[model samples]
Target chain A: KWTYFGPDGENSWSKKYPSCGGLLQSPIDLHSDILQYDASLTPLEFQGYNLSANKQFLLTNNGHSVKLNLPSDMHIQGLQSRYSATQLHLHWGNPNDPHGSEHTVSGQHFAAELHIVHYNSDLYPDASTASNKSEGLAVLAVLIEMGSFNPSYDKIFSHLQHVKYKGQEAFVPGFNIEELLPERTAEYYRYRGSLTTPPCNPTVLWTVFRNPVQISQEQLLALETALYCTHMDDPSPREMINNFRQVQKFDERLVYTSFSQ
Target chain B: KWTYFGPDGENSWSKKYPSCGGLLQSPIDLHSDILQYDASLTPLEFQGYNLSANKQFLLTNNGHSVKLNLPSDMHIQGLQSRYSATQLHLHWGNPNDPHGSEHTVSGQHFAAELHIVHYNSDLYPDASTASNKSEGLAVLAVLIEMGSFNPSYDKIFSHLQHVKYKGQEAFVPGFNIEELLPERTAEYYRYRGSLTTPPCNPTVLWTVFRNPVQISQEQLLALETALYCTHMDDPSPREMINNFRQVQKFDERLVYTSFSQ
Candidate 1:
């Protein structure tokens, strides 16, 4: 029922989904004042980070976003507990604009954003119950930019044609986590936020990398045009684009960068 | 059958409607290079232009625009033939961007546009049959700026709330056509072009005024948001806005102005 716009979407979400209008929400704008380069913050450490082409992942069109199921073996350290990889997905703008990173850098938007979702498996049973807890989820967000063609992304994007409709699924060959992320993972902003999508629980410890991941215009078009926000059999077939939330207000929250710029 | 951005929209309209990709098209960018001050040209002259509120008009949301049907008694001169007023309509943008004028001044976009459509009633029977003739239509386009409140615009806009859905109709109290036009009607661009919308026949004598007509922000929203491009019975409702066509090429055509810059 929650879309990017219309009566059931953004402004009226509180009536349908209660947690969507909660106090600490995700997709807040990062400005000069809140971003502090803290020397104490360390680089992001991930377990089983070097995932090879040994697994076959599932790509799904969830009517809201194109999500890929992640291997539970992957985990991130340096948190309250080990956070295992749950799932990863993306949020983007249209082909014309083709720029909409949910979490902006200094109030500037990017072409797209990739959110690699992980949950604190050590303390919590699963992501559903852990989503509301204070130290439940850890998300690594990478900004997408239009530049040279990225072969790493093609491993998943090329399969988008199969899952073009909502609730559709396709197989995606596995690759290393480094290929999915930017070159400099050590340099990122650390902040406590919530899921950008509903239910927007404030349980995520977000690490947004400074360096952006490069993708070609063609791949972006597939994600922007090929996917449909509505079901294929729906009376109105709407193209899935601008599937992102606008930047919300940031309360008294401090954002720390692992590396000094 | 045509839309703004689909297979039936602007891009492939040529394949659908051959005339859409013709040499002459409405809604062109007004630039200094293509413009020349024609000393031979006279001020825009119209007949029955002073129709008072004693008469009533019909306003309809036609799933494309908010169209107002005019009387055949009204006419404009100073051209090839006696062009009579058929009907007038509007094109506008959403409240978010609010700049979607069809004809731009030196590439600067205005908030909205007004098209006072007329046909060569002397040469042809009516607007529909005459629309395909070489010199059968004379469209007076005026740019709309968001500023001081315009009372003339209120006469039509205040009634828009009732005709909120497509195909809905309402009665609009008439006012003098001069109030809807810009104060500086003497300075204008005279060009040979086609209808901005499809079945884009090259049969129009376009007179885009230089100065813009002013309207309050609230009235602009009524024109932009209070209308729907989809039918009332449509499963998914769509807001009617940004109905103006993109700027087309001049294509060896000279743009003549009545006044010097």
Candidate 2:
């Protein structure tokens, strides 16, 4: 399996996943000079995001990251096609050099990033069928920074201890997902790019929020140090940290922003 | 098994070389977080550094770096024991990134780094004999940046093309080695650490100069692109870039600075 570090890292991923080296890669830098204000870009509507209190979600350490299985009913309404939620995951750095967001702003990185992944349900059968097709996927990205304690994030962080190893799973009771996003959901930067991970399908319609959510340093430490990429019995265990990819070259592509400075 | 970039990179170095994951490692970040002012720390005296221009030294592409073998007579004074010169090598980043110094200052890396390795000659027979022992090695490090062209560094860099691939070697007329070091050699940071490379011997006394030397962007680009880690006839060639190790945690160790701020 491909990893974020070592011999099987991002550099060698393209050898196996040809698309990882191809055109239109995700996680491009969002800076002021390269941004273009688009008046047509409107606020995305989060539909069925608040799950029932009795319902539970599957949280797993998927080797490369910690992912919480999202229900298809939870979808975003404002895109061209109805994109149903597929899954939501995180990318973070270690405690020492904690700036690990996949996309940087003004050449500076945040502590971590959250990707709420979705598939165009109206056009494709499911996330798998939609993964490689054009305009098949959409991902809402939220940048995270270290600040005051965040109970909203802790709702998922508290369950991390249970799924500490790869393939391990834990049941997390449902909560309001909207609380995870930062204030001013109307402002965002949009682009057409690929999945940050391999089989890096260049099919994603990205929406990176301009405002960053805040989590405590302790919470960041928990998210950073609590998980491993290997099974519990493996003699050698790799910690799941710095799971984010480096920013790709923006090149000729332009990032359209919903807000004008 | 250890290369800087992929499967065998720094994170996985511990699997094969235990000391890489252990305490007292070299190339730590020289930030103010752990730096302490020591009145006892003095300027190191570079003795026998000016080699005769009539003589020649062997410069070889060791796969990891282009190294110039030094004579045992060139030693450093002002330490507890006399440490004679062994070899001098460099660590650098690629043309895209360019900042790849082994050690960082105040959480920032320079363009590259130059390390002059030495062995305790008074107690050991040779560098090989002194390698794994206690109080065995000492290294003088000079941080490099992009500024004016550095002629002194060019003396060794000019021969890189002659030894472009692994195991390739060339003879270079000896010159004044001290010219490669930065001005104000009197100011430095001293600490007890290990060899930055594997076998990661933790028996070194590190003296990193406070002032950094400069090289032109063109010269740095040449140095970054000149060498390859693969053999000349290898089917898959790997560029020798970002060859420096990540900064190790200082932990309880105190970095003593000669100059008080």
Candidate 3:
């Protein structure tokens, strides 16, 4: 009834996927039909490194991922408990869907979304070097839609011309993550799920806000322009052509939304 | 039918609270309650400001009012319109009402709220120098509830001891306004109202989020400890109590909410 897609296997999923046991899978069909659960079960509150408007440490690899040095106090649950900021990556579709948004709610999918991945701080006091399978991780998902030009995106977009492929690293100075978030944060949908990538680690605690941030078409295209090609070796062609995943099944798990119906 | 209680002016309602043709009167209760206005008449959006974590700004009494130099370019409406960073102040109740909120919604209120006011950049080229009357202002209201210690409020609370009273000033070198905001932003009630102060100009576009930020009893008391007794020149021992106004009626105004209830 099950197929072996191990890391050493010849399957394409095996080669690209980070883990085989990850229950956190992406492309979740977050429709309104999903029943709500008691809020008490969820982590009532969490404190992490404060990323305000005046302080942050950001590192970017142009087309790949942006690693932010978040404060060690940042914490998330459902995975390993204490989660610290690790790195953030963006996934998107090609051309029409260049901004790769991984989660969709009520049949609406944003062009792209920002995933702020944080490792369980309790499991590994030093998140920078922890690879323990059970060491906990949480991802704060923010959806970005196509709209008017956002000057905030200029810092990351303008640097795309430098690192346009995998492994291309660039130290972005003074980049603030708060600028990337939407103004309406009080409403969000949270649940337990696997990482969008392989390993399908179901240990993640996902917090996806209800509102989507808007970025102009030109700005999105600028992001596309900086990505590596589908083939890691080929820098000329864009690699983030179709990075999004299809929605997974809901099964028995419930997705709780902050919105009051 | 009006009784004149003036000329003794100091203690006369006719002179102190002129009804028919008073130069200095309480804000006129605009009675055009039947005007069905659109909430989208002026939408509030994020201005690309570099908001970071753990950064604090000192509330300096720069001759006019206490000012806090915010580190972000806050925007409302859209990219075409922007707001410049201004100052922040506190307004609370005398007996410390269980619910000490400045604005009430459906009769619910909080213990306190942080008002991060920003000047409308579109109206005045320079927000800092322009007259406070003609300048456009946007106030982001964050509700504060009495509870456990909120690390977010630590920086500001810690400085209370230094600026405890009128004319008292302190240099808070690293204050960040972003940390004072609620985690969920998009979920808010928006409406147009007048400034909750003297001159009572009705030019403010208020965005009050539903979520309340929690602070410990000690922290709340710390803010209360910073209060000055008596008005500007009076020697009254009234404890400079209850500096907020009662919430105005909705006046048939549409309270635009982001959620589809």
Please report the candidate that would top DockQ against the real structure: 2
Question: What's the candidate order when arranged by decreasing lDDT?
Answer: 2, 1, 3
Model 2 lDDT tens row, B83-102: 99999999997776677788
The local lDDT score (0 to 100) that residue B203 gets in candidate 3 is 55
Q: How accurate is candidate 3 locally (lDDT)?
A: 0.54
Error in Å for residue B166 of model 2: 2.4
Q: Write candidate 3's Cα lDDT for A21-83 as tens digits.
A: 223344475754564744544432345433555554455553334344455655554433556
Number of the top-ranking candidate, with lDDT as the measure: 2
For model 1, how does the per-residue alpha-carbon lDDT over A158-241 read when each residue is reduced to its tens digit?
A: 888898899999978778766788987888888888888877777888899989988999888877888998787999887888
C-alpha RMSD (angstroms) for model 2: 6.7
State how far residue B181 of model 1 sits from its true place (Å).
0.7
Q: What DockQ results for candidate 1?
A: 0.02
Q: Which lDDT tens digits does candidate 3 get at residues B1-261?
A: 111011111112222222211121111122222223344434345553434544555565322223455654545544244766666766554333333456654334466667777776766865443324443666788888887788867866666656545566675655344667776676666555656653345556566765788888877766654555433465653343344443332322455554433
Q: What fraction of the true interface does each of the listed models get right, in terms of native contacts kept? A: 0.00, 0.00, 0.00
- How far residue A49's Cα lies from its native spot in candidate 3, in Å, is 5.8
TM-score, candidate 2, is 0.68
The TM-score measured for candidate 3 stands at 0.42
Q: Give per-residue lDDT, candidate 3, residue B99.
A: 39
Best by TM-score: 2
Model 3 chain A: which ten-residue window has the lowest total lDDT?
Answer: A1-10
